[PDB]
Structures are given as structure tokens and as C-alpha cells.
């Protein structure tokens, strides 16, 4: 079966923009927590999120008018630019290729939706709503604008809306699409933008931390909402080798499971099935996994369930299990894509990024979470977990090329 490799990474994140900045942030235990600017936090009793601080679309976006996209779309396009830059691919190389572009998202331009409702509510009149906003709110656009910006007409542009798992779904789809032989290249990842919808949702769930995100901590109090984009260039080994491309890591496999249990609650059996499917697809034994990049959101339920699933699969000596969201916060549709990149970078640079804000490991999460500081390791194979609402689990396995 055809081998598939990661030749480019594009990153817009709360802890760094570009592969360099992001590798730095990850190694540093940078926290992306900062005050919310994107919308009015009056009344939430709380106003911290993990925004992208200083996004300059002009660095990345050349062709598509900015008003054709909301923030999530802009992040997607910027990361895509970066990723193809990082892969040594120009618009000329891309125009020629049949490709898949698959961007995951949770909320898409839900901020634009909110602003639309604001316009109707201010005016007391639906007709006050801006056409420019209403044209760009549909999630499909996150994929198609990338094609537009990179001048790639011969693209299947699929936005995967499996929320936190969407990045991993997207990478997996790229993998399947390349493995099928039908395309030699896939731009895969996820993108989301901080919005009032997500903040208010998690607030109302009591799943927002009042200070910091402490995954697997005994007194973890929840998440911070995040945003950003991660785009990965996937390529057939054939196509990468033949092009003289630098290969960051190999995509070995993934697994998809569905809990078929609860619309919001994680499911131990469901996560465990996903992990096992991923290992089987990857052709990889529990032993060979150097670390797990956990879904690890920092909520009570998630961390104890995910831990349990990991221990089910690996037995009572599981690999080191770290939570990138300790640093990024929960970047929604970007989360697993930014995790995937972290995993690839961890492979490439021989490190394991930390679970930060870690005071004390929950005794029911008997894991080495690599607390607070990155460690060096001979990281050859990494599992990246992701779970979402609607019981959607996706687990991705990357390896050293």
C-alpha cells in the first residue's frame, strides 16, 4: 500500500505562527491564554481564551479578498500558504496536481453568524444583515478558499465538521485519498476562530476553567476556548522523493470510531476502539508508541475517560500521554490538526511537548503527562488522539520517515 509523508506544516496558533514559532512554543510550554478581544465578554464573569494575538493576513493571503472569509477561513488560508511554502510547493506546482483539500472545523465562521444576528438585533430588522457576512458563514468555504488562494481548481475541497476530531479526520482522509492512488497530494488540517457561541457553550456547560487549563490534573476545572489553523501537506512517498521534498514525518495510519452512546460525553470503549483501529491501520504495536498526544481537554469527564481508554488499550504501563491543549487551549476544529503538527515536530526534533499548568496528576489518570517541561526522547512513533461531540473519535499515528 502506498506510503504517505508529511512534507509541509502550516501553523497559526495561540503559541506561535509558522513551523519555527510553533516548534518554539511547544518546546517552551508557552501558554496561549490572553484576554479575549474578538467579542464582548461583558457578563460572562470571565474573559480569557487562547486567541491568536497578532494575525496579519497580508503576510499569507494574496488572492482571495479578506471579506470573502471570516477569521477561521483566513487562518485556514494562511496556514495553507505556510504549509505549501514549508513543503517547497508553489502555486505553479499545485495548479498541475489533482489534490484533496480537507479542513476540519467545529464552529467555522460562527463569529460572523453572531455579528449577523447583532445587525438584525440592533436594527430590529432582518434586512440590516450584511450580505458579505451571510455569504461566508458556510463551513464548506473553509476548504474552497484555500483552493482559490493557491489557484488549485482540480481539488476536492471538503470541510470535515467533526469538531475537535476534525483535524485528524481530515489528515486521515488525505491519507486514504493518497493511499487510493487517486491523488498524490492532500492539504489537510483544521481551522477555527474564537467566538461568542463557543465561549458561551463551554461556559454554560461549566467546562470553562476560571484560570488555566490543567489536563490530567487532580483539580482541573476545564478548558479555555482557542482558535487557529493547522495545515499539513500530505504527499505520496513517490511524489515527495521524486520532488526532492524534505519529509517531516510519515503518516502511518488512523482510526475512526463512533461511541454511539452520548452526544457530548466521551466514551471509554469508543476511544479505545479508535486507538486500536489506528494501531491496526498503522501496523504498529502498543510497545512501539513513544507518546500519545491526548485529546486531553482538561475537563473532569474527558481526562478520566480518555486515560481509562488509554490504559485499556496499553495496559497499566501506557506510554507518556501529554495534552497540547494545556498550551493551546481548546482550538476546536484546529485542535487535532495543531496536535498532529506538534506530533510530527516532536518526531522530527526528538522532543515530547509538555502538559503545562500541572500541579498534581489525578490519581485516576495514572499517566506520565510529561508535566510542565518538554523532554528529549527518541520519538519515532506518535499517537494523536481526538474525540469530539457526537461520539466522534479519530486517532492518528505518525512515524519517523
Amino acid at each position: 500500500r502506498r506510503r504517505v509523508v508529511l512534507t509541509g506544516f502550516g501553523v497559526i496558533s495561540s503559541i506561535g505562527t509558522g513551523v519555527e514559532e510553533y516548534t518554539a512554543g511547544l518546546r517552551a510550554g508557552r501558554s496561549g491564554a490572553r484576554p479575549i478581544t474578538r467579542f464582548d465578554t461583558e457578563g460572562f464573569g470571565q474573559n480569557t481564551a487562547c486567541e491568536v494575538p497578532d494575525f496579519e493576513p497580508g503576510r499569507w493571503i494574496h488572492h482571495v479578498p479578506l471579506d470573502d472569509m471570516g477569521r477561521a477561513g483566513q487562518y485556514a488560508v494562511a496556514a495553507a500558504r505556510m504549509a505549501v511554502d514549508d513543503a517547497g510547493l508553489t502555486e505553479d506546482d499545485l495548479g498541475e496536481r489533482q489534490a484533496v483539500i480537507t479542513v476540519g472545523t467545529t464552529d467555522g465562521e460562527s463569529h460572523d453568524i453572531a455579528v449577523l444576528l447583532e445587525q438584525e438585533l440592533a436594527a430590529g430588522d432582518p434586512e440590516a444583515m450584511d450580505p458579505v457576512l451571510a455569504r461566508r458563514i458556510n463551513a464548506g468555504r473553509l476548504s474552497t478558499v484555500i483552493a482559490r488562494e493557491l489557484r488549485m481548481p482540480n481539488v476536492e475541497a471538503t470541510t470535515v465538521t467533526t469538531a475537535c476530531a476534525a483535524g485528524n479526520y481530515s489528515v486521515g482522509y488525505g491519507l486514504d485519498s493518497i493511499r487510493s492512488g487517486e491523488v498524490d497530494i492532500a492539504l489537510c488540517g483544521g481551522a477555527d476562530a474564537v467566538c461568542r457561541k463557543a465561549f458561551a457553550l463551554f461556559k454554560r456547560f461549566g467546562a470553562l476553567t476560571p484560570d488555566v487549563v490543567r489536563p490530567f490534573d487532580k483539580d482541573r476545572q476545564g478548558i479555555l476556548t482557542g482558535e487557529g489553523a493547522g495545515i499539513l501537506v500530505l504527499e505520496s512517498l513517490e511524489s515527495a522523493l521524486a520532488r526532492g521534498a524534505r519529509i517531516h514525518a510519515e503518516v502511518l495510519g488512523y482510526g475512526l470510531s463512533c461511541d454511539a452512546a452520548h452526544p457530548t460525553a466521551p466514551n471509554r470503549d469508543g476511544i479505545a476502539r479508535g486507538i486500536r483501529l489506528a494501531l491496526d491501520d498503522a501496523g504498529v504495536e502498543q510497545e512501539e508508541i513513544d507518546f500519545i498526544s491526548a485529546h486531553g481537554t482538561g475537563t473532569k469527564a474527558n481526562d478520566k475517560t480518555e486515560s481509562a481508554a488509554i490504559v485499556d488499550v496499553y495496559g497499566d504501563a501506557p506510554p507518556r500521554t501529554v495534552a497540547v491543549k494545556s498550551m493551546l487551549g481548546h482550538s476546536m476544529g484546529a485542535a487535532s490538526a495543531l496536535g498532529a503538527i506538534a506530533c510530527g515536530l516532536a518526531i522530527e526534533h526528538g522532543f515530547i511537548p509538555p502538559t503545562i499548568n500541572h500541579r498534581e496528576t489525578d490519581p485516576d489518570c495514572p499517566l506520565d503527562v510529561v508535566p510542565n517541561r518538554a523532554v528529549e526522547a527518541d520519538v519515532r512513533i506518535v499517537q494523536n488522539n481526538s474525540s469530539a461531540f457526537a461520539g466522534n473519535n479519530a486517532v492518528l499515528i505518525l512515524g519517523t520517515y
Binding site: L117, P131, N138, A139, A157, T159
Partner: protein
């Protein structure tokens, strides 16, 4: 049947909940009759940009799905669930389709329940505090909720995906299923797409319309297909999915993109355009829709376009479009021996620039 490449996906069943009514039978009846579906919108939806709507007639969530977990259920999810029942169960509620953990689910959407998200945000803006929302509505808000709900409902622990894309989303879903099944990630797939009618959707669509143009006739519903590998098919194939091709209309020439997409789909299917027996455009009420129609009217035999009534009879069904298109082909084909072995082409264009084409071979 015997002529098919190895691992060609086949559709072995379908279901629809549509402006024709609930169920495959009602859809099939409506398509074959070329029946109209537009009604005056229910007063309960409040003011709308247009009074005329193509809603699912006689559709009440609790009546269809019973009292459990349905009070706060979004219509999108409800439509998907009712469609799932039509697909997997027979008319008496018997299990018609054997599913297991290798049964995938992939649903195409535009942007989920805009009713849910806009109600949530309206509450956020107008209630005491900005997180004082209907908390019971929150599960339903997730874009992947309909696909996930289907899995809860039918105990589908296999791959569960939701893809966006609007009018092309049914074809993106189909191609997704095709690829995953191709890689052995599923042996069977529930594939389809869905769009609810909501005042939010209707107003947003009106807002998004090219300024001047009349408020579109909007429809809703869900179409679903049971897809299997031809080898392993446990029920007789209705149609083989020969190719699904997609493009993005980056140069704002939707005609040219449709043409290129269709020609590629036909090439990849190994068929000539003259072989197309039924061609079903999405009939989007847009320049792109008109261009699509002109492109196909040149590309396929004229008789392929008269074979199936216009999708315009359902209104703009949004994400449901391509699934309704495929279902219309199957409806036209069923109970008409003339359709056997014939090629069908379905094409859709979406505002967000995507074009997709599928080429089917009708079996039965």
C-alpha cells in the same frame, strides 16, 4: 452487475424525507409525477423573506421520533433520523439492513442547524447573562450532531463523519465513503446529506443572495443511501458509483468548471457523454445554477435532461440537493426496465465555489 471493476461501490438502498413527504415512496411518487411542493410557510416560523416554502409536509419531530430526547431536537437531526429509519428499517420497523461496527456514516451539510445556533446566540444576546441559553438545545448544536445521533439511534460504532459543502456535500460525502470503503475502513456506508428549513436559514440565504434577486424558493430534507462493495453487497445493487469528481470554480466560470468536472467524471467512469441516459443538475437559482444547466445541456444528450423532472420542483434544498438528485435518478430508474445498465450523471454547484459530478450506472 458482472461488468463492474472490483471494489466498485453500489447503492443498495435509499431513503428520503423531502418536500414530497416522508419516505422513499413519497419521494419516488413526487419525482415520477414531477409534482410541485411549494406551500405557504407555517405562521409559527415567524416573518420570512418569502411566504412560499418547500417544507416536508406532515413532519412533526415528536410524532415521528416519539417523546424521548425530541423536545429540543433540531429539525436537521430529526430529518436525518427519520431518513435513517427509512434506510435501515422496513415499513414495519423490521431491520432491513444488517449493520455492524464496519458500517460507516457520512452526512453532508451546509452549516448544520442554523436554527439552533441562531436561537442560542439570540438567547446569549437578549437573556440576563450571555451564557443563559437553553442548555438542553446545546447537544443538538454540534455540526456533527445529526450523524452522531444516527449512530446512537442505530448503534453504529463505525466511522462517523459529517462534511460540509452545501449543495455538493452529498457528493463529497459519497466520495468520502467511496474512498474509506476503498481503504477497508467500512464495508457498508450510510451516505447522504440534509438541510433543515429554518427562519434563520431562509433569512441568511436572502441576505446572501446577489442583491436584487428574489428571495429563493427554499426546500429541506434528507436523502440517504446505503452503499456497499459490489462483491460483498448483501442486497441487490440499484446503482454503481462509477466516479465522483470535484473541482473548485476559482475563475468564476461555473459553466467551464461544471464542463471540466463532468468530462473528467465521464472519462474516469469510462463512459462517453452520449451514453448518459439521465442527467440531473442541482438547478441552484443562481448564475452558477444557470451556467450548470447550460453546460450540461451541451454536454449530455438532450433526452438525458428530460428524463428526470427539474430539482427546482423541491426548491433550493441546500445540502440535501445532491442526495435528492441521486434519489431522483434512482426513483426514475426503479420500476422501469428501460433504466437497467443506463448511465446517470448528477451535478451540483455551491455558492462557496465547489463543483461536483457523479456518474452512476443504473442496475436494479
Amino acid at each position: 452487475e458482472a461488468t463492474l471493476p472490483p471494489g466498485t461501490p453500489v447503492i443498495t438502498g435509499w431513503s428520503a424525507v423531502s418536500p414530497y413527504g416522508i419516505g422513499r415512496a413519497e419521494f419516488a411518487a413526487g419525482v415520477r409525477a414531477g409534482a410541485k411542493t411549494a406551500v405557504k410557510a407555517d405562521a409559527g416560523l415567524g416573518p420570512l423573506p418569502s411566504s412560499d416554502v418547500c417544507t416536508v409536509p406532515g413532519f412533526d419531530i415528536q410524532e415521528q421520533l416519539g417523546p424521548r430526547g425530541t423536545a429540543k431536537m433540531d429539525r436537521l437531526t430529526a430529518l436525518a433520523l427519520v431518513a435513517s429509519d427509512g434506510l435501515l428499517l422496513d415499513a414495519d420497523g423490521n431491520r432491513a439492513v444488517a449493520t455492524d461496527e464496519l458500517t460507516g456514516v457520512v452526512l453532508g451539510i451546509t452549516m448544520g442547524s442554523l436554527e439552533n445556533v441562531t436561537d442560542f446566540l439570540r438567547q446569549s444576546y437578549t437573556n440576563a447573562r450571555p451564557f443563559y441559553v437553553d442548555a438542553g438545545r446545546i447537544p443538538f448544536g454540534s455540526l456533527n450532531h445529526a450523524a452522531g445521533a444516527t449512530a446512537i439511534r442505530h448503534d453504529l460504532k463505525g466511522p462517523n463523519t459529517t462534511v460540509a459543502g452545501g449543495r455538493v456535500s452529498g457528493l463529497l460525502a459519497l466520495n468520502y465513503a467511496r474512498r474509506l470503503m476503498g481503504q477497508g475502513r467500512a464495508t457498508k456506508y450510510l451516505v447522504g446529506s440534509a438541510e433543515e428549513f429554518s427562519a434563520a436559514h431562509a433569512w441568511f440565504e436572502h441576505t446572501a443572495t446577489a442583491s436584487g434577486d428574489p428571495a429563493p424558493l427554499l426546500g429541506e430534507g434528507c436523502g440517504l443511501f446505503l452503499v456497499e462493495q459490489a462483491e460483498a453487497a448483501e442486497r441487490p445493487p440499484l446503482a454503481a458509483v462509477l466516479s465522483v469528481e470535484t473541482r473548485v470554480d476559482i475563475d468564476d466560470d461555473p459553466g467551464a468548471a461544471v464542463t471540466a468536472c463532468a468530462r473528467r467524471a465521464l472519462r474516469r467512469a469510462g463512459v462517453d457523454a452520449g451514453e448518459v441516459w439521465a442527467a440531473v443538475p442541482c438547478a441552484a437559482p443562481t448564475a452558477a445554477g444557470r451556467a450548470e444547466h447550460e453546460a450540461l445541456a451541451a454536454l449530455v444528450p438532450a433526452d438525458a435532461l428530460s428524463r428526470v423532472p427539474s430539482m427546482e420542483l423541491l426548491g433550493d434544498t441546500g445540502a440535501a440537493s445532491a442526495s435528492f438528485q441521486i434519489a431522483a435518478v434512482l426513483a426514475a430508474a426503479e420500476a422501469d426496465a428501460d433504466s437497467r445498465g443506463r448511465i446517470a450523471l448528477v451535478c451540483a454547484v455551491d455558492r462557496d465555489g465547489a463543483v461536483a459530478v457523479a456518474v452512476l450506472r443504473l442496475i436494479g
